[PDB]
Design a protein around this nucleic acid. Structure first.
Ligand SMILES: [Mn+2]
Lengths: 338, 338
DNA sequence: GGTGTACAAGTAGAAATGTCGTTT
DNA sequence: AAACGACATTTCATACTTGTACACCTGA
DNA sequence: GGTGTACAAGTAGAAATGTCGTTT
DNA sequence: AAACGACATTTCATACTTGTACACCTGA
DNA sequence: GGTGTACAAGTAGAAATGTCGTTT
DNA sequence: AAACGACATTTCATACTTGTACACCTGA
């Protein structure tokens, strides 16, 4: 019993025995029986053998012509990056499943885009670009991160749920989780740190506020802590903090200039330029997930142990990111680079 | 110039030509040089050939043993539906990447869990069960949804941006979307409806509260418009609304009383049980995406086009889902059903 | 609810053959 | 007998169709 | 900033097949 | 020469391993 | 975040006397 | 002494009006 590939094989053999198409065909018919290609099909193959080959495959058969070739659909994404298949479909005369396939065929894949801090304003942009521009220049004259003490303030929710993902067979419930309350128990952490470590931090008790007055207390307390912790700030201290309604007030301005600290220029709506946000907290967020301290002091034991178990260089890295981190902001002409 | 399979193909041929084993090797040598398998394999082949040769394949050869039974990685999931490969791997005593593949080798895929309105108390769970049980029971006796009228308030943020997702080559960047302001401008929509459509609705001026006293005023105005829009009730309106502290006041309960409306019992923390929520706003939830509202007059404008644009089918359907919900709520024991 | 995607199955052009009369 | 030349036939990966499964969103 | 999943390339047992001396 | 039978040797789809690239979260 | 209803705990009358007149 | 009426003065007893705390909407 034979096959149309195996058949071709035999004929390669029958050929290499110096045998004619005819005396080859009648072999086949006697070995296998009457259902076996035509003499004409043997003669056919013979001609191909005298050129020489293993015709492992047929050459590609006939096929429908493409209704839209690649470079066309590619030009649609070049217009607008993120349209839906249903929707490039309409522009291409073709169905949806149709579009899915070629997208799969091309190198393409869908990814969920990034969240950006806030909708920036054409001024607000020139304003960032500049600060970045200025600070960066002033950097290269003489590095000053070595001096720089920075700080911010972030909420610590008491329970931090996040949706659980389950490995299950298609069409089954994946493990579901109950919503986090928006108006739930939460403290408020404010921490100041420098390139070496964490200098001093307060944990404002549940339902707590930071007012022009409050901040000064902290500021002065920070310095109190600073004296003994960084033994000898020869080199004047450089203070980087967000333009909160509180920090921006004239009351505090006075309390700052009297400590004589330098305030580093800062841009509105720019947490992506502020070490505490994009590096220190960013770490913490991973570390806080699925966690729930039920007591205010459990938060403190956690914070205390967290900072203590942090590496030393981890902070350095954070702070030292700043320069090229600006070089980026300016390369965007005051955009959010991501 | 053969391989080991074209080799069985020639020996299947030479077999039928009544050539002996050692006979076909002589031919095999002169056709394809001294480059082929040994006599011994021909002999071997030939015994197979004598009683159903049918080499469909090399019959499966050796392999390393498995380390964990498929069904043993399974028992891990029966414990925790939602683990990470790294984490299973560990208990399996084996590599993440290893586990990665037994997951596609078995059926399993990964899906995100539901978010669920509340961590439900042992009691609150049966508070629900009952109320469902209860309503579902009178429904069994005779449908009464024909005269059930319901409402609930819900927020309409002025800007609501969705995170945009995009088709791009691997490692290329997505599209980025500017975060929503946690607390921008928002109007607060109070709406009431029955199986025939929206009865009445008000759109509260941004930052507008709804207090025991203000609610009554609405209720009344609702009823005022009810005798007009539904003259049917001149010839018992079942009111379905949530245990809101505003809707729950001594004053309101006593106001409602002398309107002579029956208030359907409605279990606390049960928004999946109240049509307004799971059906009306849910329809809205979608058609609000990417939308912007420059002024409060647009939101009026936008509300009407929508409300009037939906056919009675849509509403009737929404209310008529109630029984199959209660049916569910009951044999879930009051747990938010899937 | 409402949407978006990708599998599942269908329904349409050259090569590889087949048929048949012609050439050696 | 052997091979060819010029038709018609049959073969099958392809480019698309519709139908629809089912992940995930949506109101809380 | 940290973590989680899949693609890539590499490294470890019985069938297929080989070598040789026996048996007809 | 043809075949076997017994003992040694080569072969390959397998089941894991390192490497990884990369989509995403993370912080406002 | 909003709000409202129950049960505080704290800051606002109607009976206790207290001090006078009296007169005999 | 001994009465007993006016009416200031000093408690005890309810009608207040903030106050704490728990409930239910909900959702960075
Ligand atoms: Mn801040």
């Amino acid at each position: 019993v034979p096959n149309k590939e195996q058949t071709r094989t035999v004929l390669i053999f029958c050929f290499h025995l110096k045998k004619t198409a005819a005396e080859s065909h009648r072999m086949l018919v006697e070995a296998f029986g009457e259902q076996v290609p035509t003499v004409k099909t043997c003669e056919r193959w013979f001609q191909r053998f005298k050129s020489g080959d293993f015709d492992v495959d047929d050459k590609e058969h006939g096929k429908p012509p493409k209704r839209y070739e690649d470079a066309e659909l590619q030009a649609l994404l070049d217009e607008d990056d993120a349209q839906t298949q249903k929707q490039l479909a309409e522009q291409l005369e073709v169905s949806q499943q149709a579009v899915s396939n070629r997208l799969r065929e091309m190198g393409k894949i869908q990814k969920v885009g990034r969240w950006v801090p806030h909708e920036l304003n054409e001024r607000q942009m020139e304003r960032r670009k500049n600060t970045c521009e200025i600070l960066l220049s002033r950097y290269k004259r003489k590095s000053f991160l070595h001096r720089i003490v920075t700080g911010d303030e972030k909420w610590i929710f008491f329970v931090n749920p996040k949706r659980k993902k389950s490995y299950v067979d298609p069409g089954q419930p994946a493990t579901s989780t109950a919503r986090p309350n928006r108006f739930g128990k939460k403290t408020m952490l404010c921490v100041w740190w420098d390139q070496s470590g964490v200098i001093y931090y307060e944990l404002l008790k549940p339902g707590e506020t930071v007012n022009a007055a409050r901040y000064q207390q902290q500021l002065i307390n920070l310095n109190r802590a600073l004296q003994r912790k960084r033994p000898e700030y020869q080199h004047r201290v450089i203070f980087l903090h967000d333009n909160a309604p509180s920090h921006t007030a004239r009351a505090v301005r006075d309390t700052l200039e009297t400590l004589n600290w330098e305030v580093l220029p800062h841009a509105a709506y720019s947490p992506d330029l502020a070490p505490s946000d994009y590096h220190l907290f960013a770490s913490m967020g991973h570390a806080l997930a699925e966690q729930r301290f039920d007591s205010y002091e459990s938060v403190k034991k956690w914070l205390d142990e967290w900072f203590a178990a942090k590496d030393d260089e981890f902070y350095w890295r954070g702070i030292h990111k700043l320069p090229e981190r600006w070089e980026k902001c300016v390369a965007s002409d005051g955009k959010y680079f991501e």
